[PDB]
Amino acid sequence: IVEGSDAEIGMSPWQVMLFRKSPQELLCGASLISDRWVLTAAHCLLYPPWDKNFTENDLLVRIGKHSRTRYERNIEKISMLEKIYIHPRYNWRENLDRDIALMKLKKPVAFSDYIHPVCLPDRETAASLLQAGYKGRVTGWGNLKETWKGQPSVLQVVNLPIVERPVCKDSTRIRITDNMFCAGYKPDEGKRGDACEGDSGGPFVMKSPFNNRWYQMGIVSWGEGCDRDGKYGFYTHVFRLKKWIQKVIDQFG
């Protein structure tokens, strides 16, 4: 996260770290959506242009974390994966369309002050809140700058406004789809902030003013550089992929 700040303790209790077993390193962010299911970006697990194709036994999920690198004894919980599910129409060849994956945990995780699931939005909550200018919140342990202050000691947080779709489209040569939205400040707005490498797969959340609950509207998906003027971060549109999420969980849960 570029131009963010340290999270408060328990601020993002659904935040998950995808952790490579060997070598031991951060792979991606993710989010907890129930006691057994974790949501991430498909490109965190499968991206053939970079020879990335992880299997369940390659990875662990670490839940309840705040420090990036420390083993947070008595706070974090580490879970193994039973199965990965990648959207069957995930477009890794072109533009990361439908950049979404689910991971089922081997055993349910115990909730705590530091571990708690986020909601996924209904049609009406999505329609009300996914509007240009409305701000959401992105969290992760990724890079603090596009090139390298390099990597953070603790989880970082930034609040960013959703951008009008024509502005998103006009900022890039990549083909954007209805399964994506973009967020970030414009050059004239002064303020800054963005996701970056390592934040992939983490959540873009909004706090509903109707029921005071947090909803995950997006998944950190792609950008061109990090925090560049006139560029924006792109997020998988969670609601647009609801039918697939529900089909996977209804069938394999």
Partner: peptide
Amino acid sequence: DFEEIPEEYLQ
């Protein structure tokens, strides 16, 4: 750069 995690999680 990461602190080792308990061995039980790598079995």
